[PDB]
Amino acid sequence: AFWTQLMLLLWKNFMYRRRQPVQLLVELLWPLFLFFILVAVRHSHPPLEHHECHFPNKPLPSAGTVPWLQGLICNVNNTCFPQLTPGEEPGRLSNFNDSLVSRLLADARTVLGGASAHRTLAGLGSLLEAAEDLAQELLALRSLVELRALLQRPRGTSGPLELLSEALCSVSPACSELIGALDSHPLSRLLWRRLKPLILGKLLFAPDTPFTRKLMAQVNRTFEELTLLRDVREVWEMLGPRIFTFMNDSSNVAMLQRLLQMALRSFLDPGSGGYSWQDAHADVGHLVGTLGRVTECLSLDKLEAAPSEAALVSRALQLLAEHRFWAGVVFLGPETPDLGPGHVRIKIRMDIDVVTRTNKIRDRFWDPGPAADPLTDLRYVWGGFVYLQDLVERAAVRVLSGANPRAGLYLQQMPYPCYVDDVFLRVLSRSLPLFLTLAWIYSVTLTVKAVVREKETRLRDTMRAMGLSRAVLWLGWFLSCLGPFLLSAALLVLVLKLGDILPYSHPGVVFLFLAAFAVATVTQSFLLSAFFSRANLAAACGGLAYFSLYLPYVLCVAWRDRLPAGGRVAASLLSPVAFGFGCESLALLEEQGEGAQWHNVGTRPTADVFSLAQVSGLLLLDAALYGLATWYLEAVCPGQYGIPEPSPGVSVRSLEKRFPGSPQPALRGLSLDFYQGHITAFLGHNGAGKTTTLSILSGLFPPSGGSAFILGHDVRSSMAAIRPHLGVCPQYNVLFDMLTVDEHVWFYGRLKGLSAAVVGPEQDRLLQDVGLVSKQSVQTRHLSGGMQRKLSVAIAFVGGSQVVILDQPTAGVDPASRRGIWELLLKYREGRTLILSTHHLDEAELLGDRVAVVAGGRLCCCGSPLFLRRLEEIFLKVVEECAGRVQGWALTRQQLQALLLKRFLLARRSRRGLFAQIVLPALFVGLALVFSLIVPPFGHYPALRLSPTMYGAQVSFFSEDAPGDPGRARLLEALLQEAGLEEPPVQHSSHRFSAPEVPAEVAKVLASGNWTPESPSPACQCSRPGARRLLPDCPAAAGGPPPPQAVTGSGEVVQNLTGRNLSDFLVKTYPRLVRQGLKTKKWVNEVRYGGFSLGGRDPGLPSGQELGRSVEELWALLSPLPGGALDRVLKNLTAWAHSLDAQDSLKIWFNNKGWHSMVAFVNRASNAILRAHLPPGPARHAHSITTLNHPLNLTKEQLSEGALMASSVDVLVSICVVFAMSFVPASFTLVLIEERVTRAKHLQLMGGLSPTLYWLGNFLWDMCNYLVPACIVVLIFLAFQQRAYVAPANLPALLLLLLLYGWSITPLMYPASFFFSVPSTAYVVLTCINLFIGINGSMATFVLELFSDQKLQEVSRILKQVFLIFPHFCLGRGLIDMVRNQAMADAFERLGDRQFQSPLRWEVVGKNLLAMVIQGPLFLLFTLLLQHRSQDEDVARERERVVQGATQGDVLVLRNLTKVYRGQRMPAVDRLCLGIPPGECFGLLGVNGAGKTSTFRMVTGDTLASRGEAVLAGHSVAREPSAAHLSMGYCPQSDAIFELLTGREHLELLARLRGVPEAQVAQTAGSGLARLGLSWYADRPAGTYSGGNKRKLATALALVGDPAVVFLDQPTTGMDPSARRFLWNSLLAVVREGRSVMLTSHSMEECEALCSRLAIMVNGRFRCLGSPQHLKGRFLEEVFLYFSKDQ
């Protein structure tokens, strides 16, 4: 019956799914909200493609001084123009052109060279004519006019820097004052804030050898020449007064000058003196003063000294504090490459904030783009490393060679092709694993809760007792839970693929991966649900254990290096870790732009060696391991309801049971024997232990000793041969809520073993025999006690049961159905060994062929009924043989002191629950910090020698221009010999370069085209706009009409590239290397890293040398002063004029894709220059220069200025703490719901408690239980020294945040306690809702506010203020803003600006606090508002009297009461009128379906009415519920007690709440306990009583305190004759006192014989309403039946 049982289980699960569809829909739609938000954001963030653009030139200080400053000031940004920059042209050399300074210099050159001979002749002494001719062209130029216009600009704008940039580029206390004026504009302050160390620096060298002194003297030349401004200012200062005196009072000389004159504008220039003697003088004076201040800005004393390297490091550490460090050069002594001098080793040390990190030679991932960010990529330019290296290297070359080389190095970045990027893919790749792991948290918790709840209510054990096998049940659970997971995974795959989040991947492999993940999760949940045995405890520790298995993934991704593959494999056993590895592999495959379309299953040999074909096998292995572990754990440890762990049909011998809680054993020893087919009956007093014995016979409990045999087998050990031979009937019915009676019987009959053919007749026969045939399409949750009991006994009798045990077959059942019970028992008595147990003696004597009585755990006597006769009286004899008011505000003080005490007691018995509910979430945060704070230590950045030999094979350049010079040829051959290509011998003088062969098709295409090097040779390539398929441009074979002349060397290849355009070659060829390199797509072996270009064209006019002649022809005359100031300025003018001719350029093309690229090529260029200028000889290797790079020992890390917060450990810890604090405000509803459901809260509300006091007491207790997690969180943060969160500056913010979150979350979970029926489901649902609304709101807004800034910043600002109603959001954003502000403050402190903000601000945390405080108590007000939502002939004569007459004596008056069960056609209760006077024990009988309990619930106040009224002592229950509730007592059919408290606590609590004085509380409780026979069991917890004791306790809580009217419901459902005698005596006493009773039952005596006014009720209508003797006279069980048949 394996397949039949499987079909039955699947059908039942399908029926449950179909009955309630909303839960199915919400489960299927839960894990997609965050992905929906992500897709919505992505839809509005189109991919961006960048146009082609070329980068500009960058001169080095070796090329001069003016161009160096020009390139430093103008080219701050890497503004790349799409049009070709003039610098890239081989002929051109000066990118900056037609500017003010360049035009001024050129025009000055021209004017000075034009008439040098004329001024020489003038100085020889006509000359006036030559001077006039020169002055004629001194006005033709407009450069002087524009210079005057610029220097006359009114002062303002941003400062001198703006005018300096305008002049250079193309469209001392005073110095400090200028800086302070300039810093007001951050745009103008960019230059200062990037160039602070250049003005203030110190150059330090460790050795003090005179060789190093010569090196520094050679370095010092540029600083020496920079100070000519002081000398020229002094010269003008000396000339000032002299010319000022000469001009004044010299009219005679001037007039004789005009007399000797005898063009015209020159003659009129001295006229009136307005335009000659002051304007030009003032302008030149202002200019010289300005340059004097400029030269006084500099310190001019940059160099310093140091004894050794230790003193160097100490002085560096001292000087680093006050912004004075710019150097560190060390002339280390290798003595080493080889013997002999010239093997100098320069080792530059500089701060880590300025030099690129040397950890990585290249980048990490192939990101398409030139990577030319002028703020975080080109650090070597704005830092000054390259300038210092060039200066030191040129000085070393000058010292070693002894010559005067002239070769100005330049820098040029090659262009980059068109491309398109997807930033969103990289952004989401980091946070995908967290999203995916957090998506499936609903289903795991619900699965664990469902499993533990099914195993808790004995439903699983009862279902298994009839023949179910554990394997079948487990497989059914597996399939049923696995279904929705697979459907949801398929839907998620579909939505991911359709949304273009993962466009490349084929959905099949992704779906298989997700299905494997889902299977692993299912089996993990089934394993996790095997430790616990209580619904509350299992629900509490259900999400923490799942989410605590994901942190090791973070630990193992932080420790990526130094990790053996064995460790990764051993840490991949946990499912979330393996899924994280798989998700990372898939994300990196997607980012590579190659997809996973069924052929990428053995790829990725990198650090992420795992691909999406090895993780799935691991996941399946983990699922198998978890399943085996679950099976073993279930087999070895059953749980609370411990199943056994591997013709006298029934026999028990020496059977005893011992519960740990009870000091005395329940059972001592039994020897009872069972027989063939004689109905046996158990008789005994309450607490004898018949139900415990019956459970011991079944598999519910294990015996504490002895053994029990059934059908010759043994329930001990081998009980597997018992299942098809047993039938069970628990005292408390266990049934499926949704399934109806017909489905119940069909399911149990099929499971029992009946064939599919014999079902209908048997089921119908049993259903008719029992008496339930009138109802067949109603679910069991709409049935009263009697119908449920009849259904339970019917289910017990379904199928062929060899031995069946009946326990309380009838209870609350009228005799009419008891007759059907009798006939059912008689019809099956032939061999089925019927066993019975009831308190009714008539049934025992009528059926019992042998009666056995047990008392006090011992078999008193067993035998035939005739044996004992020689029945109620003798059984009772045997059992006997064996056995003012405090009123006012003071009362308000008392009530609370009771109520809170109750809570405290409920907290003392169950400490494990509190430990797991209000402590464990705090320790989860500590575990998160422990696992997220362990990082690998770092030491020092290693030193490396900078040369391109560390890259590998590559491609160089050879471009040359103007070959008609020997020096350029020598330098070029030096470059070739340095590259590695040795000089070929005489036989290969011209056999050096091997030109490859052009393809035939390309050759034909070029023949159809033009073979012109100075025209665009390559064909145009198509740009690809988005389209997600082709990122780079479309390649072609037309790039370069000749193939490059590749010549191999010792590992490198050098080409020719002479005469070609040289700009299109790289652009057209790069996409070929882009597409060719696909194996790794992270560290692709690019072949083009850099090259040279020897442009020998000199940007000097041929007349420039003439300038020097002019200067020297001014030196001989004018009496050169011996002081030397004039002499020295004239000789630095002559030197500048001579150097204006220059020698050549050595332009360097560098690729920024390789980090350490420009420095190595500068090194090689300088080494080649040295080898060129060296005299010929075999000492080529004897003299070599190497540049190192080693940052200081100062312990810091690379400051990522551009990279802001990017979903890091900070937000991880914030998510962890939010998760931990979301669980705590859910344990507060368990007790509330448990009280409301069992109708125990309403008892207290009857006691005299106003709802307001109840709610305030609960609120205070819940508040007192919230401060325990917060203290532990604060202590953990303090212990771990988390500066970001806890510190003497931000501690008040955290304290207020936690305290007010506690203040405002608690009164929000109260309204949810009205609409739930089982506590654990409410617990898990509220926990999941809190988790979702917190995380997926706050962290989603955080993701929105970062990364993309396309007005999504404005969208996030809009959404931020809206999410203030939820008190969960006020903890997420608050704990992220603090971290962000702390990070910004730390960055400012590291920078040195020393700016500190404030934690508590309006726009930081203040608004959240204010809003959450103001919304705090509104939820409590809503809670109270929702709580106060409710705003014959005798019968006819009685109705007429009630309608018209007004009996003031009567206490309770009913007026036409009726109410319908939400459309059940015939109203159960309708049109009732009655009047009761004081001091009459009213009674009311009926049948199972009359509606007695409905009448009690309608009149007592538990349910709201429909029509009519129920007035109780003046105040109506509906009009004023409080006044009616003031004085009455209740006892419902379903007993209302607390499982953990005891009886004495119950009585004392009710006594205190009613208002009795404190002194008499104990006396009243003792009297109440002793009155009803409850004393020997008045200290044990109320949860361990049996049915009779619980009934007695429930009755006792209805009479304590002497109320007015007692609304006793059926009180004798299971009480014993002694107990019922006690109850009758108590009722007689209370009615003698003068208080009425409204007992209703099916029994006799006080209900019937001692009653006062019976009233039979059938189908919601009264029948007689007459006295008992009156009923007997006019018309006792048979009399009642006759009267029922009378009408």
Ligand SMILES: *[C@@H]1O[C@H](CO)[C@@H](O[C@@H]2O[C@H](CO)[C@@H](O[C@@H]3O[C@H](CO)[C@@H](O)[C@H](O)[C@@H]3O)[C@H](O)[C@H]2NC(C)=O)[C@H](O)[C@H]1NC(C)=O
């Ligand atoms: C080396 O090859 C480059 C190709 O990149 C040549 O530059 C190209 O020069 C032509 C000159 O006509 C440019 O055409 C112009 O395009 C603009 C675009 O708006 C148009 O408005 C003009 O009317 C003109 O047609 C072309 O854009 C430009 N290519 C670029 C910038 O990528 C360069 O001249 C070659 N070197 C030589 C021939 O020495």
Ligand SMILES: Nc1ncnc2c1ncn2[C@@H]1O[C@H](COP(=O)(O)OP(=O)(O)OP(=O)(O)O)[C@@H](O)[C@H]1O
């Ligand atoms: N779970 C339990 N833990 C500890 N003691 C228990 C437990 N259940 C019952 N007992 C105790 O064991 C004894 C046997 O009483 P038991 O509950 O078995 O009676 P019963 O057969 O159900 O009787 P009744 O006919 O009155 O319903 C009592 O003292 C009872 O308090």
Ligand SMILES: Nc1ncnc2c1ncn2[C@@H]1O[C@H](COP(=O)(O)OP(=O)(O)OP(=O)(O)O)[C@@H](O)[C@H]1O
């Ligand atoms: N939840 C429900 N939904 C629909 N009908 C119900 C529901 N509960 C009870 N009924 C029906 O409404 C009527 C009211 O009966 P009620 O529940 O008051 O039982 P009772 O006969 O007074 O109790 P007892 O079973 O203890 O003798 C009955 O016909 C019953 O079958």
Ligand SMILES: *[C@@H]1O[C@H](CO)[C@@H](O[C@@H]2O[C@H](CO)[C@@H](O)[C@H](O)[C@H]2NC(C)=O)[C@H](O)[C@H]1NC(C)=O
């Ligand atoms: C690289 O190619 C150029 C192509 O011009 C070579 O320069 C030519 O060299 C030959 C022989 O030396 C001369 O006859 C030509 O006159 C040169 N060209 C021009 C325009 O003058 C150059 O020699 C090649 N590189 C090397 C190292 O040989």
Ligand SMILES: *[C@@H]1O[C@H](CO)[C@@H](O)[C@H](O)[C@H]1NC(C)=O
């Ligand atoms: C460089 O970029 C900054 C920042 O966008 C901008 O303000 C400035 O105008 C740009 N150009 C120059 C020459 O600084």
Ligand SMILES: *[C@@H]1O[C@H](CO)[C@@H](O)[C@H](O)[C@H]1NC(C)=O
């Ligand atoms: C740019 O420089 C060249 C160099 O000779 C010069 O001829 C030209 O006038 C300058 N200005 C331009 C091209 O606008």
Ligand SMILES: *[C@@H]1O[C@H](CO)[C@@H](O)[C@H](O)[C@H]1NC(C)=O
């Ligand atoms: C000479 O200087 C005096 C002031 O020092 C001035 O008043 C006078 O005008 C000057 N003379 C000439 C001719 O500039």
Ligand SMILES: *[C@@H]1O[C@H](CO)[C@@H](O)[C@H](O)[C@H]1NC(C)=O
């Ligand atoms: C370097 O030049 C500066 C000029 O101010 C000065 O310290 C000195 O002349 C030189 N120092 C040397 C040669 O050590």
Ligand SMILES: *[C@@H]1O[C@H](CO)[C@@H](O)[C@H](O)[C@H]1NC(C)=O
């Ligand atoms: C330039 O002038 C400075 C002093 O102003 C002098 O030290 C230096 O030697 C001069 N230049 C040359 C090449 O002599």
Ligand SMILES: *[C@@H]1O[C@H](CO)[C@@H](O)[C@H](O)[C@H]1NC(C)=O
């Ligand atoms: C940095 O200084 C520490 C001082 O304890 C020393 O142990 C370490 O070796 C130094 N590192 C380097 C690279 O000099």
Ligand SMILES: [Mg+2]
């Ligand atoms: Mg019992």
Ligand SMILES: [Mg+2]
């Ligand atoms: Mg009832």
